[PDB]
A and B are shown apart, each in its own frame.
Chain A
């Protein structure tokens, strides 16, 4: 069971080192390409794919972005729950909390319908 902060902390150094490695291999591919094209063939060695490098870099970047976004969403959820409901859970009777949530939803829907009828009357 890994945590968002833990996964972020373990992914950041992997991301940095992957960036370093991909930049090194890109520079190697570039100098090899120039030596074979501009000058004479001197780098008699096979280079790397060079596609997997930045591909996995972008993959880890997307992973980090989405997990940090999930953590932000969780914090926002907690904040909005604490603002729209008191901190009470098994203390508060669960059916009463469900009824209160249903009434809150109905009240919000009523306010929205009132504003919509208002806008329509403005039309």
Chain B
């Protein structure tokens, strides 16, 4: 429901229109303080009209208009007002909603800025792994599956849009030893280790290994595998290469910083 942001923007716009009206009528209530060469400050008056032209910005709200026109009479809210009149203590529900949203955003910002850790070091479960894999499989166009043909370690494969499927061996976490193979795969009777490529997919595997060694966290493997899955899914397009042309080399793929760009650019 991003229309709330649009309505807040419209409120800010109309408040700015009122403020600009007040400001221009106040400026008209004063003359040239000290010009001594030309009363060019009257041009600021015209500039004030530009702020009044910002009223047309409120007309932009007509594009954001038609945000809500439905039934759903306030979404299951009325309990005491439209219900038991004696049930007056209702608003506690809305208070709790606001409290929870505030706590959520507060803790989110706190965790986001707490990246500057201060802990030096630490000095003085296959079912869980399969469950984490299945939970990560919950994203669209990211059909993954595992079989564990050899060993107690995890053998996971991912196929997003093309025949560029990737295999990643895990040890219940921090899945290292990545191998991407475009257009064949599981030869013999299980996953293979051919690692054949077109001198570019091998580079992609190198990038994946670099990320795995880079996105390795000291604990909490959930966030680790989540960042891993997002980093891999970011390859769904492979069609744009900023900071250079589209043919800087054999192929231009390296989104390590949440944005794809031309390869060989570190």
Contact = CB atoms under 8 A, between A and B. Distances in A.
Interface of A: 3-5, 8-9, 12, 16, 19, 54, 57-58, 61, 64-65, 68-69, 71-72, 74-85, 87-89, 97-98, 101, 104-105, 108, 112
A65 B1 contact: no
A61 B4 contact: no
A105 B100 CA distance: 11
Contacts of B65: 5, 8-9
Of B10, B62, B97, chain A has the most CB atoms within 10 Å of the CB of B97
Contacts of B97: 80-81, 83-84
A71 B96 CA distance: 20
A31 B72 CA distance: 55
B74 interface: yes
Given A68-B14, A72-B7, A3 B76 contact: no
Contacts of B7: 68, 71-72, 75
Given A5-B68, A75-B67, A105 B92 contact: yes
B28 to A, nearest CB: 9
A19 B101 CA distance: 39
Interface string B1-40: 1011001101100110110010001000000000000000
B93 A3 contact: no
B223 interface: no
Given A85-B76, A89-B76, A75 B4 contact: yes
Interface residues of B, number: 37
Contact of B8 (A64, A72, A87, A105): A72
A97 B69 CA distance: 26
A61 B16 CA distance: 11
A68 B96 contact: no
Contact of A61 (B18, B72, B76): B18
Contacts of A112: 99
Given A54-B25, A85-B76, A112-B99, 11 more contacts: A57-B21, A61-B17, A61-B18, A68-B7, A68-B14, A75-B7, A75-B67, A97-B76, A97-B79, A105-B92, A108-B100
The prevalent SS among residues of B at the interface is helix
B69 A5 contact: yes
B66 interface: yes
B79 A101 contact: yes
25 contacts: A5-B69, A12-B58, A57-B21, A61-B17, A64-B14, A68-B7, A69-B11, A72-B7, A74-B68, A75-B1, A75-B67, A76-B4, A79-B1, A80-B97, A80-B101, A81-B74, A81-B97, A84-B96, A84-B97, A84-B100, A87-B75, A87-B76, A105-B93, A105-B96, A108-B96
A72 B13 CA distance: 14
A39 to B, nearest CB: 18
Contacts of A89: 76
Contacts of B93: 84, 101, 104-105
A52 to B, nearest CB: 15
Contacts of B109: none
Question: Among A54, A65, A79, A80, which residue has the most Cβ atoms of chain B within 10 A?
Answer: A80
A78 B1 contact: yes
Contacts of A74: 68, 74
A98 B96 CA distance: 15
